[PDB]
Backbone as JSON, one array per atom type, in Angstrom:
{
  "sequence": "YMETGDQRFGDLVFRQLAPNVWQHTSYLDMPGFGAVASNGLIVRDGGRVLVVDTAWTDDQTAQILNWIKQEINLPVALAVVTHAHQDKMGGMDALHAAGIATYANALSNQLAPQEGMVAAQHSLTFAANGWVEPATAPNFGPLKVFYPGPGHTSDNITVGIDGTDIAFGGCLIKDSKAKSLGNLGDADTEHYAASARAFGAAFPKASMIVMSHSAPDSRAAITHTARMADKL",
  "N": [[195.13, 147.1, 112.05], [191.95, 145.64, 112.34], [190.71, 142.08, 112.33], [188.11, 141.75, 110.29], [186.01, 139.9, 109.37], [185.01, 137.75, 106.8], [183.79, 138.26, 103.78], [180.86, 137.99, 101.97], [180.44, 138.17, 99.07], [177.75, 138.16, 96.39], [178.21, 135.55, 94.38], [181.07, 135.2, 95.24], [183.75, 135.11, 97.67], [185.22, 137.15, 99.65], [188.81, 137.4, 101.23], [190.66, 138.66, 103.92], [193.63, 139.53, 103.83], [195.49, 141.39, 104.37], [196.91, 144.62, 104.97], [196.52, 145.99, 102.85], [195.87, 144.16, 100.84], [194.25, 141.09, 99.8], [192.5, 138.0, 99.48], [190.59, 137.2, 96.7], [188.19, 134.54, 96.11], [186.9, 131.64, 94.29], [183.63, 129.56, 92.81], [182.97, 126.82, 91.36], [181.12, 123.92, 90.18], [183.14, 121.15, 89.18], [182.85, 118.14, 87.03], [182.7, 115.02, 89.07], [183.61, 116.65, 91.5], [182.71, 118.22, 92.44], [182.06, 121.27, 94.53], [184.66, 123.59, 93.42], [186.76, 125.29, 94.81], [188.57, 128.14, 94.31], [191.53, 130.38, 94.19], [193.06, 134.0, 94.16], [194.31, 136.98, 93.66], [193.92, 140.07, 95.59], [194.98, 143.49, 95.48], [196.44, 146.87, 96.62], [197.47, 149.35, 96.01], [198.65, 152.44, 96.69], [196.79, 154.77, 94.98], [195.89, 153.11, 92.97], [194.59, 150.19, 92.31], [195.89, 146.59, 91.71], [195.1, 142.7, 90.45], [195.64, 139.95, 91.12], [194.75, 137.1, 89.2], [191.48, 135.31, 88.05], [188.39, 134.82, 87.77], [186.4, 132.05, 88.1], [184.63, 132.24, 85.97], [183.46, 134.78, 83.13], [181.24, 136.35, 84.46], [181.33, 136.54, 87.61], [183.72, 137.18, 87.33], [182.97, 139.69, 86.6], [181.78, 140.46, 89.51], [183.98, 140.67, 90.48], [185.38, 142.9, 90.42], [182.9, 144.62, 90.65], [183.08, 144.35, 93.41], [185.48, 145.26, 94.06], [184.52, 147.8, 92.84], [182.7, 148.67, 95.11], [183.86, 147.71, 98.0], [186.47, 149.48, 97.59], [186.89, 151.46, 95.31], [189.01, 152.29, 93.8], [190.81, 152.8, 90.29], [191.29, 149.72, 88.53], [193.91, 148.71, 87.74], [195.73, 146.69, 86.52], [195.55, 143.52, 85.77], [197.79, 140.11, 86.74], [198.33, 137.2, 85.24], [198.07, 133.95, 86.64], [198.55, 131.66, 85.39], [197.41, 129.4, 82.35], [194.58, 128.32, 83.15], [191.06, 127.22, 83.2], [190.31, 128.57, 86.1], [191.85, 130.29, 86.35], [192.19, 132.24, 84.46], [189.6, 132.33, 82.86], [188.08, 134.57, 83.33], [188.53, 136.74, 81.75], [187.89, 137.79, 79.59], [186.14, 139.71, 80.56], [187.65, 141.41, 81.42], [188.87, 142.87, 80.14], [186.88, 143.98, 78.86], [186.18, 146.04, 80.45], [188.29, 147.07, 80.38], [190.67, 147.15, 81.01], [194.46, 146.52, 81.22], [196.01, 143.62, 80.69], [198.28, 140.81, 81.98], [200.07, 138.08, 81.13], [202.75, 135.19, 81.39], [204.29, 134.76, 78.36], [204.24, 132.8, 77.18], [202.08, 131.47, 79.18], [200.63, 132.55, 77.36], [200.82, 132.03, 74.16], [199.74, 129.38, 75.3], [196.46, 129.6, 75.96], [194.65, 130.39, 74.4], [194.36, 127.18, 72.42], [193.34, 125.54, 74.63], [190.53, 126.98, 74.61], [190.11, 129.84, 75.21], [190.77, 133.35, 76.05], [193.58, 135.06, 75.57], [196.2, 137.28, 77.91], [196.73, 140.44, 76.65], [198.82, 141.05, 77.3], [202.63, 140.09, 76.96], [205.13, 138.75, 79.49], [208.54, 138.32, 80.0], [211.03, 136.71, 81.19], [214.08, 136.7, 83.45], [217.53, 134.69, 83.2], [217.47, 134.38, 86.11], [215.46, 133.66, 86.76], [213.82, 135.92, 87.76], [211.46, 138.28, 86.69], [212.09, 140.12, 83.39], [212.22, 143.8, 83.31], [211.75, 145.41, 81.81], [209.5, 144.66, 80.5], [207.58, 144.04, 82.01], [206.11, 147.09, 83.33], [205.64, 148.93, 85.76], [204.71, 147.45, 88.16], [204.55, 147.82, 90.91], [204.56, 147.27, 93.44], [204.22, 144.18, 93.26], [205.71, 141.56, 92.96], [207.21, 139.67, 90.56], [207.4, 136.19, 89.94], [209.47, 133.3, 87.75], [209.75, 130.53, 88.53], [210.39, 128.45, 86.33], [209.68, 124.88, 84.8], [207.19, 124.07, 86.05], [204.77, 121.64, 88.22], [203.2, 123.27, 86.2], [204.95, 123.61, 82.4], [204.46, 126.78, 82.12], [203.81, 127.97, 84.86], [203.95, 130.68, 86.84], [204.31, 133.24, 89.59], [203.85, 135.0, 91.83], [205.39, 137.45, 95.08], [204.59, 140.18, 97.06], [205.29, 143.47, 97.85], [206.05, 144.58, 101.17], [204.99, 143.16, 102.35], [204.5, 139.81, 104.03], [203.7, 137.96, 102.34], [202.94, 135.73, 99.74], [202.87, 133.87, 96.51], [201.63, 131.0, 95.06], [200.39, 129.62, 93.28], [199.61, 127.07, 90.8], [201.49, 125.69, 91.68], [202.12, 124.74, 94.39], [201.14, 122.89, 97.1], [199.22, 121.81, 99.36], [200.62, 121.9, 102.63], [199.35, 119.76, 104.17], [198.96, 117.62, 101.53], [198.15, 114.68, 99.72], [198.41, 113.63, 97.31], [200.65, 115.37, 94.53], [198.8, 116.48, 92.77], [197.68, 116.6, 89.69], [199.51, 115.66, 87.25], [199.93, 115.91, 83.88], [200.82, 118.35, 82.15], [202.76, 118.78, 83.93], [206.45, 119.12, 83.91], [208.2, 116.56, 85.14], [211.0, 116.28, 85.78], [211.73, 118.61, 86.83], [210.45, 119.84, 88.15], [210.47, 119.31, 91.47], [212.97, 120.87, 91.9], [211.39, 123.39, 91.06], [209.55, 123.82, 92.43], [211.49, 124.5, 94.86], [213.54, 126.7, 94.03], [211.05, 128.56, 93.39], [211.31, 129.06, 96.63], [213.01, 129.76, 97.57], [214.0, 131.77, 96.05], [211.59, 133.71, 97.5], [212.05, 134.38, 100.18], [211.45, 134.88, 102.72], [208.8, 134.96, 102.83], [206.12, 134.06, 104.87], [203.65, 133.22, 104.3], [201.64, 131.0, 101.86], [199.67, 131.47, 99.28], [197.36, 129.15, 98.35], [196.08, 128.1, 94.87], [193.94, 126.2, 95.62], [193.42, 126.03, 97.99], [193.55, 127.16, 102.09], [195.1, 129.51, 102.92], [198.62, 128.8, 103.07], [202.11, 128.4, 105.21], [204.77, 128.34, 104.66], [205.97, 125.11, 105.11], [203.59, 124.15, 103.59], [205.49, 124.8, 100.76], [208.16, 122.69, 101.38], [207.14, 120.37, 101.54], [205.72, 120.56, 99.34], [207.97, 120.21, 97.7], [209.55, 117.39, 98.74], [207.02, 115.25, 98.05], [207.75, 115.84, 95.48], [210.13, 114.72, 94.74], [209.85, 112.4, 94.47], [209.63, 111.17, 91.81]],
  "CA": [[193.8, 146.41, 111.8], [191.48, 144.02, 113.42], [189.98, 141.12, 111.37], [186.66, 141.95, 109.63], [185.19, 138.29, 108.64], [185.24, 137.3, 105.74], [182.75, 138.65, 102.77], [180.67, 137.28, 100.98], [179.48, 139.34, 98.17], [177.29, 137.52, 95.07], [178.77, 133.57, 94.27], [182.23, 135.21, 95.65], [183.85, 135.0, 99.26], [186.77, 137.57, 99.35], [189.08, 136.84, 102.46], [191.72, 140.29, 104.0], [195.26, 139.46, 104.14], [196.7, 142.74, 104.49], [195.88, 146.06, 105.39], [196.74, 146.26, 101.18], [195.59, 142.89, 100.11], [192.68, 140.6, 99.78], [192.45, 137.1, 98.5], [189.41, 136.1, 96.29], [188.06, 132.94, 96.26], [185.1, 132.01, 93.8], [183.63, 128.89, 92.52], [182.8, 126.05, 89.57], [181.19, 122.71, 90.63], [184.06, 120.05, 88.18], [181.94, 116.9, 86.85], [183.05, 114.64, 89.87], [184.81, 116.71, 92.86], [181.74, 119.0, 93.5], [182.08, 122.91, 94.43], [186.03, 123.67, 93.58], [187.29, 127.1, 95.25], [189.87, 129.12, 93.22], [191.64, 131.92, 94.92], [193.09, 134.76, 93.6], [194.58, 138.37, 94.78], [193.44, 141.92, 95.16], [196.36, 144.49, 95.82], [195.9, 147.63, 96.51], [199.65, 149.78, 96.17], [197.69, 153.64, 96.68], [195.64, 154.82, 94.37], [195.27, 151.91, 91.99], [194.1, 147.89, 92.38], [196.52, 144.95, 91.01], [194.82, 141.71, 90.28], [195.98, 138.21, 90.33], [193.94, 136.16, 88.24], [190.4, 135.95, 87.37], [187.76, 133.84, 88.53], [186.5, 131.09, 86.93], [183.99, 133.33, 84.7], [183.54, 136.51, 82.81], [180.58, 136.56, 85.36], [182.13, 136.27, 88.66], [185.4, 138.13, 87.26], [182.5, 141.07, 87.13], [181.24, 140.39, 90.45], [184.71, 141.2, 90.95], [185.45, 144.14, 90.05], [182.13, 145.22, 91.35], [183.41, 144.03, 94.66], [186.54, 146.42, 94.22], [183.81, 149.6, 93.09], [182.53, 149.64, 95.85], [184.31, 148.23, 98.82], [187.86, 150.37, 97.65], [186.75, 152.64, 95.04], [189.92, 152.71, 92.55], [190.55, 152.34, 89.31], [192.2, 148.73, 88.66], [195.05, 149.22, 86.88], [195.74, 145.8, 85.53], [195.37, 142.65, 86.02], [198.23, 139.5, 86.34], [197.75, 135.83, 85.05], [199.5, 133.04, 87.18], [199.22, 130.05, 83.94], [196.51, 128.96, 81.49], [193.5, 127.24, 83.01], [190.09, 128.13, 82.96], [190.34, 129.09, 87.32], [192.9, 131.78, 86.76], [192.25, 133.0, 82.86], [188.67, 132.0, 82.62], [187.61, 135.67, 83.15], [189.79, 137.14, 80.63], [187.07, 139.01, 78.6], [185.53, 140.45, 82.04], [188.51, 142.13, 82.01], [188.92, 143.33, 78.51], [185.77, 144.89, 78.5], [186.59, 147.27, 81.75], [189.84, 148.35, 79.41], [191.95, 146.55, 82.1], [195.55, 145.78, 80.85], [196.09, 142.09, 81.05], [199.55, 140.85, 81.64], [200.57, 136.87, 81.48], [203.95, 134.84, 80.71], [204.2, 134.55, 77.16], [203.86, 130.71, 77.33], [200.39, 130.85, 78.86], [199.66, 133.73, 76.3], [200.86, 131.1, 73.08], [198.53, 128.26, 75.6], [195.65, 130.28, 76.02], [193.8, 129.97, 72.8], [193.67, 126.62, 72.11], [192.49, 125.8, 76.13], [189.47, 127.57, 74.05], [190.27, 131.11, 76.16], [191.54, 134.7, 75.78], [194.74, 135.1, 75.9], [195.88, 138.37, 77.46], [196.86, 141.43, 75.95], [200.71, 141.92, 77.66], [203.3, 138.95, 77.13], [206.35, 138.86, 80.28], [209.56, 137.68, 79.67], [212.46, 136.64, 82.67], [215.6, 136.84, 83.11], [217.83, 133.24, 83.74], [217.23, 133.54, 87.63], [213.68, 133.93, 86.84], [212.92, 137.84, 87.87], [210.43, 139.36, 85.2], [212.43, 141.82, 82.8], [211.56, 145.2, 84.15], [210.72, 146.11, 80.48], [207.79, 144.03, 79.76], [206.54, 144.6, 83.63], [205.35, 147.93, 83.61], [205.54, 149.7, 87.25], [203.72, 146.91, 89.2], [204.37, 148.54, 92.43], [204.76, 145.77, 95.05], [203.99, 143.06, 92.62], [207.67, 140.95, 92.24], [206.67, 138.04, 89.06], [208.46, 135.22, 89.31], [209.11, 132.3, 87.49], [210.79, 128.96, 88.66], [211.12, 127.46, 85.43], [208.67, 124.49, 84.37], [206.3, 123.34, 87.66], [203.33, 121.59, 87.78], [202.86, 123.01, 84.3], [205.64, 124.5, 82.02], [203.92, 128.1, 81.97], [203.38, 128.36, 85.79], [204.35, 131.64, 87.37], [204.2, 133.09, 91.1], [204.95, 136.89, 93.09], [205.48, 137.84, 96.28], [203.87, 141.31, 97.04], [206.77, 143.94, 98.37], [205.85, 144.93, 102.03], [204.56, 142.23, 103.34], [205.6, 138.52, 104.12], [203.04, 137.1, 101.77], [203.6, 135.2, 98.32], [201.36, 133.5, 95.53], [202.51, 129.97, 94.01], [200.11, 129.25, 92.6], [199.25, 125.56, 90.73], [203.23, 124.49, 91.91], [202.89, 124.86, 95.6], [200.72, 122.06, 97.14], [198.4, 122.4, 100.57], [201.17, 121.34, 103.16], [199.16, 118.02, 104.81], [198.39, 117.63, 100.57], [198.54, 113.73, 99.67], [199.14, 113.9, 96.17], [200.43, 116.84, 93.76], [197.68, 116.1, 91.6], [197.98, 116.31, 87.9], [201.14, 115.79, 86.12], [199.82, 115.87, 82.88], [201.33, 119.67, 81.8], [203.79, 118.74, 84.95], [207.51, 118.53, 84.46], [208.71, 115.71, 86.5], [212.72, 116.34, 85.85], [211.96, 120.03, 87.12], [209.23, 119.8, 89.65], [211.28, 119.61, 93.02], [213.69, 122.53, 91.48], [211.27, 124.55, 90.9], [209.19, 124.24, 93.89], [212.8, 125.0, 95.42], [213.48, 128.19, 93.68], [210.19, 129.32, 94.29], [211.09, 129.33, 98.14], [214.41, 130.86, 97.51], [213.57, 133.4, 95.73], [210.52, 134.66, 98.4], [212.94, 133.49, 101.46], [210.85, 135.9, 103.63], [207.07, 134.88, 102.58], [205.67, 133.04, 105.57], [202.18, 133.55, 104.0], [202.01, 130.89, 101.13], [198.53, 131.54, 99.37], [197.16, 128.65, 97.19], [195.45, 127.89, 94.22], [192.54, 125.69, 95.66], [192.88, 126.09, 99.29], [193.54, 127.91, 102.61], [196.4, 129.9, 102.58], [199.38, 127.61, 104.68], [203.34, 128.68, 105.48], [206.56, 127.38, 104.37], [205.55, 123.96, 105.41], [203.75, 123.82, 101.9], [206.62, 124.21, 100.19], [209.14, 121.93, 102.18], [205.88, 119.09, 101.85], [205.84, 119.85, 98.17], [209.59, 119.48, 96.93], [209.66, 116.37, 99.45], [206.57, 114.78, 96.95], [208.06, 116.1, 94.17], [211.28, 113.72, 94.82], [209.86, 110.66, 94.39], [208.99, 111.24, 90.62]],
  "C": [[193.25, 145.34, 112.77], [190.91, 143.55, 111.97], [188.82, 141.49, 111.5], [186.19, 141.28, 109.53], [184.84, 138.26, 107.15], [183.88, 137.55, 104.92], [182.31, 138.25, 101.81], [179.75, 137.85, 100.07], [179.45, 138.34, 96.67], [177.65, 135.7, 95.55], [180.72, 133.85, 94.79], [182.81, 134.9, 97.17], [185.45, 135.78, 98.73], [187.15, 137.69, 101.06], [190.95, 138.13, 102.78], [192.51, 139.81, 104.57], [196.05, 140.3, 104.86], [195.96, 144.0, 104.16], [195.48, 146.44, 103.39], [196.44, 144.78, 100.41], [194.57, 142.35, 100.39], [192.94, 139.05, 99.23], [191.22, 137.29, 98.2], [189.13, 134.9, 96.06], [186.98, 133.0, 95.38], [185.25, 130.16, 93.57], [183.13, 127.96, 91.68], [182.66, 124.76, 90.33], [182.11, 121.91, 89.32], [182.62, 118.85, 88.54], [181.69, 115.85, 88.39], [183.54, 115.44, 91.64], [184.2, 118.23, 93.34], [182.05, 120.44, 93.24], [183.17, 123.2, 94.51], [186.31, 125.24, 93.22], [188.72, 127.5, 93.81], [190.12, 130.2, 93.75], [192.47, 132.37, 94.61], [193.59, 136.18, 94.55], [194.4, 139.67, 94.74], [194.38, 142.75, 95.8], [195.78, 145.8, 95.81], [197.44, 148.6, 96.77], [198.72, 151.48, 95.91], [197.07, 153.63, 96.45], [195.1, 154.29, 93.47], [195.25, 150.02, 92.79], [194.92, 147.31, 91.29], [195.18, 144.08, 91.11], [195.53, 140.47, 89.75], [194.83, 137.09, 90.11], [192.52, 137.14, 88.37], [189.49, 135.04, 88.08], [187.46, 133.17, 87.74], [185.04, 131.62, 85.37], [184.18, 134.2, 84.01], [182.83, 136.57, 84.1], [180.62, 137.06, 86.69], [183.28, 137.29, 87.99], [184.53, 139.58, 87.2], [182.29, 141.52, 88.49], [182.3, 140.71, 91.05], [184.64, 142.76, 91.72], [184.93, 145.16, 90.65], [182.78, 145.2, 92.69], [184.75, 145.55, 94.89], [186.12, 148.0, 94.24], [183.85, 149.67, 94.74], [183.32, 149.25, 97.24], [185.83, 148.91, 98.82], [187.9, 151.5, 97.13], [188.16, 153.12, 94.41], [190.31, 152.06, 91.62], [191.28, 151.19, 89.26], [192.91, 148.88, 87.68], [195.91, 148.02, 85.95], [196.13, 144.28, 86.59], [197.0, 141.35, 85.82], [197.81, 137.95, 86.12], [198.47, 134.93, 85.64], [199.76, 131.66, 86.17], [197.5, 129.81, 83.8], [195.59, 127.64, 82.32], [192.23, 128.37, 83.38], [189.84, 129.05, 84.41], [191.41, 130.43, 87.19], [192.49, 132.42, 85.14], [190.26, 133.04, 82.19], [187.44, 133.07, 82.28], [188.03, 136.69, 82.17], [188.28, 138.46, 79.78], [186.41, 139.83, 79.76], [186.51, 142.15, 81.7], [188.65, 143.24, 81.01], [187.63, 144.48, 78.79], [185.57, 145.84, 79.52], [187.78, 148.04, 81.38], [190.68, 148.26, 80.62], [193.09, 145.68, 81.51], [195.64, 144.68, 81.55], [197.81, 141.64, 81.03], [199.96, 138.72, 81.78], [202.06, 136.37, 80.55], [203.49, 134.87, 79.41], [203.64, 133.18, 76.41], [202.26, 130.99, 77.87], [199.42, 131.92, 78.11], [199.32, 132.54, 74.93], [199.29, 129.64, 73.77], [197.3, 128.44, 74.95], [194.85, 129.38, 74.86], [193.32, 128.65, 72.64], [193.41, 125.87, 73.51], [191.43, 126.35, 75.89], [189.21, 128.89, 75.37], [191.0, 131.64, 75.89], [192.62, 135.11, 76.14], [194.74, 136.77, 76.66], [197.02, 138.67, 76.43], [198.7, 141.56, 75.69], [201.59, 139.95, 77.66], [204.59, 139.25, 78.25], [207.62, 137.81, 80.13], [210.29, 137.74, 81.31], [213.45, 136.28, 82.26], [216.5, 134.99, 83.73], [217.8, 133.4, 85.18], [215.98, 133.7, 87.51], [212.94, 135.03, 87.26], [212.82, 138.14, 87.03], [211.49, 140.41, 84.69], [211.74, 142.83, 83.34], [211.05, 145.77, 82.72], [209.39, 145.44, 80.14], [207.46, 143.93, 81.02], [206.48, 146.12, 83.64], [204.95, 148.27, 85.09], [204.41, 148.69, 87.7], [203.54, 146.72, 89.95], [205.34, 147.19, 92.79], [204.44, 144.1, 94.4], [205.7, 142.19, 92.2], [207.32, 139.27, 91.62], [207.65, 137.4, 89.15], [209.14, 133.73, 88.62], [210.07, 131.17, 87.44], [210.31, 127.91, 88.22], [209.91, 126.54, 85.28], [208.1, 123.58, 85.6], [205.52, 122.5, 86.9], [202.99, 121.71, 86.46], [203.95, 124.03, 83.64], [205.45, 126.64, 81.97], [203.6, 128.44, 83.68], [204.12, 129.73, 86.57], [203.71, 132.55, 88.84], [204.76, 134.36, 90.78], [204.55, 136.76, 94.25], [204.97, 139.47, 96.36], [205.16, 142.04, 98.37], [205.8, 144.75, 99.83], [205.19, 143.88, 103.31], [204.83, 140.54, 102.79], [204.44, 137.41, 103.36], [203.14, 137.11, 100.06], [202.96, 133.84, 97.96], [202.14, 132.32, 94.93], [201.74, 129.26, 92.64], [199.14, 127.78, 92.55], [200.67, 124.84, 91.39], [203.08, 124.34, 93.15], [201.08, 123.95, 95.7], [200.17, 122.19, 98.56], [200.27, 121.32, 101.39], [200.96, 119.79, 103.67], [198.05, 117.22, 102.81], [198.71, 115.91, 100.58], [199.32, 113.67, 98.87], [199.46, 115.26, 95.46], [199.47, 116.58, 92.77], [197.72, 115.78, 90.53], [198.47, 116.23, 87.39], [201.07, 115.79, 85.1], [200.6, 116.69, 82.2], [202.59, 119.43, 82.66], [205.04, 118.68, 84.3], [208.01, 117.71, 85.56], [210.13, 115.72, 86.63], [212.18, 117.74, 87.21], [210.93, 120.26, 87.84], [209.69, 120.43, 91.24], [212.51, 120.89, 92.59], [212.87, 123.41, 91.98], [209.65, 124.47, 91.98], [210.18, 124.71, 95.23], [212.91, 126.57, 95.63], [212.35, 128.83, 93.44], [210.84, 130.22, 95.92], [212.22, 130.21, 97.88], [214.06, 132.45, 96.89], [211.98, 134.67, 96.46], [211.1, 134.02, 99.83], [211.96, 134.34, 102.13], [209.31, 135.85, 103.9], [207.07, 134.24, 103.71], [203.93, 133.22, 105.77], [202.56, 133.17, 102.67], [200.27, 130.84, 100.5], [198.27, 130.54, 98.19], [196.27, 128.95, 96.39], [193.63, 127.57, 94.77], [192.1, 125.79, 97.23], [193.55, 127.18, 100.73], [195.31, 128.1, 102.43], [197.7, 129.02, 104.01], [201.04, 128.5, 104.51], [203.93, 127.68, 105.11], [206.45, 125.59, 104.42], [205.24, 123.34, 103.73], [205.04, 123.42, 101.23], [207.91, 123.04, 100.27], [207.93, 120.08, 100.86], [206.14, 118.81, 99.69], [207.48, 119.39, 97.21], [209.72, 118.45, 97.39], [209.04, 115.61, 97.82], [207.08, 114.76, 95.71], [209.85, 115.0, 93.83], [211.28, 112.87, 94.41], [209.52, 110.41, 92.85], [210.69, 111.51, 90.07]]
}
């Protein structure tokens, strides 16, 4: 397949990362930071779609689904949400209104309501090696869900996509050229370096790491993240 150009649809941008995979990107102006990109994933598996997180708001999340209707036109079977923050969870209401089953780390679930956000309907749990208990993850298809341990946040979870060299660190992995690890308030600084490495180990073949706030990087984002994290 030939590279097609990145599609502007409403306030959203969609970059195709593979034949079955797209990155959705949405923006919100934060008080001093200007307009802040947030990335997510859309994944076409056979005759159904899977979504990785939401946009900043219920309204942009609705735009995402309209985009899926127009450009793909297959039912969205479910969404997985990688940690609790307005950028990942702020569109839960939109998903619930559309009838879509939502999953999050059991911990993201306990946390969201306090954050003033809507929880996912379903709670994922993980084995000691960090792969999801398959009982709690019905038919996730190509989606491979992994909990590295307490990270940047205690709830961060991550995912790769079978069939591809793609893997999504979310809030955990930072740009290879990053000057800081950013906000450590919910971070576990003892385990942060370990978490970055477990993630890399979990997805050893992944050549494309999709970042929460920036353009997908190579594995260098991981090693760079782990090292910065060893300063703590």
